[PDB]
DNA sequence: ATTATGACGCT
């Protein structure tokens, strides 16, 4: 009872803009603005594939990994933007410095995590409880929470609903108690709007978010109400919420480990977790997983918020699928002087933005046929930024996969080049 | 033949 720690110490955020890479192509080309359109990778093959749909697109059924002219059989007015090429591959440059305006908005108020190149987690403890002081027992008004969901209400027109909600949220609220999670929650809430807020009003991009005591949650809820809106997840609202939410749902059990949860453990909802000990979970999952599980099917999850704002690696893939893939020694010469090109470009901007060098350079091919999507993986230093010396160490690494007798066998159908292991410089 | 990345666990 008393003793039972609920895994309300902290307030946690994820941010998440809304198709993000369509954003900023409308962003950049206001005729795609408030249409059905998306971002795609090449044009030859099948009009390209898409990585990214705006909501309007969306409606019509186009999703991502799709080929464009698929999507465009479901939404004949689908509109696209092309991603940019250089040195005969794709090049993201375009969206991560989109992504760093973001980052830096949202690091104006806490601490984040980048979890990716749309979306961070934010460890709001701090900010609450500041905030909460500065309030002195003021009571929080529906006008401070102005897109945000409350999940579960309301209980017992959809803006009239979320209104509902809301007011029920609110009305129950203990304003006078500065240690009730609710209440630290709501004030996290308001934060979120006014990150949210900023981020609009200096980038001209949207996003969701999600509010709760964990990241696992954060994530859960920031896609309950999307696009353009923030979902609030109290740690009461769990049990009914997990009561039917698939496992394949939660961060983390989308794969294989969640298919053994469901197929081993005879269940399909999250909540159904709650009804095996510890130990149990442990015994079928390892001991990690089955802490994990115990904890997180109760609404519990204890994994930090990071402090770490910038790519912890900087990586160059193609695939070279069906017939392109390289069969001879110049092919993969010139692939992999490309790919170094583009790598040290990319370095040598983030050794001067954030004063550090990678030190090890991990090369990674696919070889035709090969089950793997990593036939092999080599490391080798990383000493200069000069891509024809990256190039030429990739070879020298990569080269005994060659079992030709100037021909390359089995032909490559990826190349993949990553530089880590970053030190202060 | 969706591709292009990137974090992290296991051993
Ligand atoms: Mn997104
Ligand atoms: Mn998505
Ligand atoms: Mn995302």
Not at 53 to 80: H, I, N, Q
Not at 188 to 206: H, K, L, N, P
Not at 278 to 285: A, D, R, V
Not at 314 to 335: D, H, M, Y
């Amino acid at each position: 009872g008393p003793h039972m720690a609920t895994g309300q110490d902290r307030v946690v955020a994820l941010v998440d803009m809304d198709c993000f890479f369509v954003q900023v192509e409308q962003r950049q080309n206001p005729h795609l603005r408030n249409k059905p359109c998306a971002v795609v990778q090449y044009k030859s093959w099948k009009g390209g594939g898409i990585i990214a749909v705006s909501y309007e697109a969306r409606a019509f059924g186009v999703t991502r990994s799709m080929w464009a002219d698929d999507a465009k059989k479901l939404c004949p007015d689908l509109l696209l933007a092309q991603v940019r090429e250089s040195r005969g591959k794709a090049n993201l440059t375009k969206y991560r410095e989109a992504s760093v305006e973001v980052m830096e908005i949202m690091s104006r108020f806490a601490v984040i995590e980048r979890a990716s190149i749309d979306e961070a987690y934010v460890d709001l403890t701090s900010a609450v409880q500041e905030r909460l002081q500065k309030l002195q027992g003021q009571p929080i008004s529906a006008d401070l929470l102005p897109s945000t969901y409350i999940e579960g209400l309301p209980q017992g027109q959809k803006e009239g609903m979320r209104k509902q909600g809301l007011f029920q949220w609110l009305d129950s609220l203990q304003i006078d108690n500065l240690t009730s999670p609710d209440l630290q929650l709501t004030v996290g809430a308001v934060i979120v709007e006014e990150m949210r807020a900023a981020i609009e009003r200096e980038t001209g991009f949207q996003c969701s978010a999600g509010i709760s005591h964990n990241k696992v949650l954060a994530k859960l809820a920031c896609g309950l109400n999307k696009p353009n809106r923030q979902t609030l997840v109290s740690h009461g609202s769990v049990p009914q919420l997990f009561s039917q939410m698939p496992i394949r749902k939660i961060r983390s059990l989308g794969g294989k480990l969640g298919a053994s949860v469901i197929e081993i453990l005879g269940i399909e909802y999250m909540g159904e977790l709650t009804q095996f000990t510890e130990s149990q979970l442990q015994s079928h999952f390892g001991e990690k997983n089955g802490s994990w599980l115990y904890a997180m099917c109760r609404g519990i999850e204890h994994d930090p918020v990071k402090p770490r704002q910038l790519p912890k690696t900087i990586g160059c893939s193609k695939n070279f699928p069906g017939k392109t893939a390289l069969a001879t020694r110049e092919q993969v010469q010139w692939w992999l002087l490309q790919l170094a090109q583009e790598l040290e470009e990319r370095l040598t901007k983030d050794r001067n933005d954030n004063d550090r060098v990678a030190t090890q350079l991990v090369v990674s091919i696919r070889v035709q046929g090969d089950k793997r999507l990593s036939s092999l993986r080599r490391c080798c230093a990383l000493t200069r930024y000069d891509a024809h010396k990256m190039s030429h160490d990739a070879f020298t690494v990569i080269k005994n996969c060659n079992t030709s007798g100037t021909e390359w066998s089995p032909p490559l159908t990826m190349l993949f080049l990553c530089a880590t292991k970053f030190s202060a410089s």
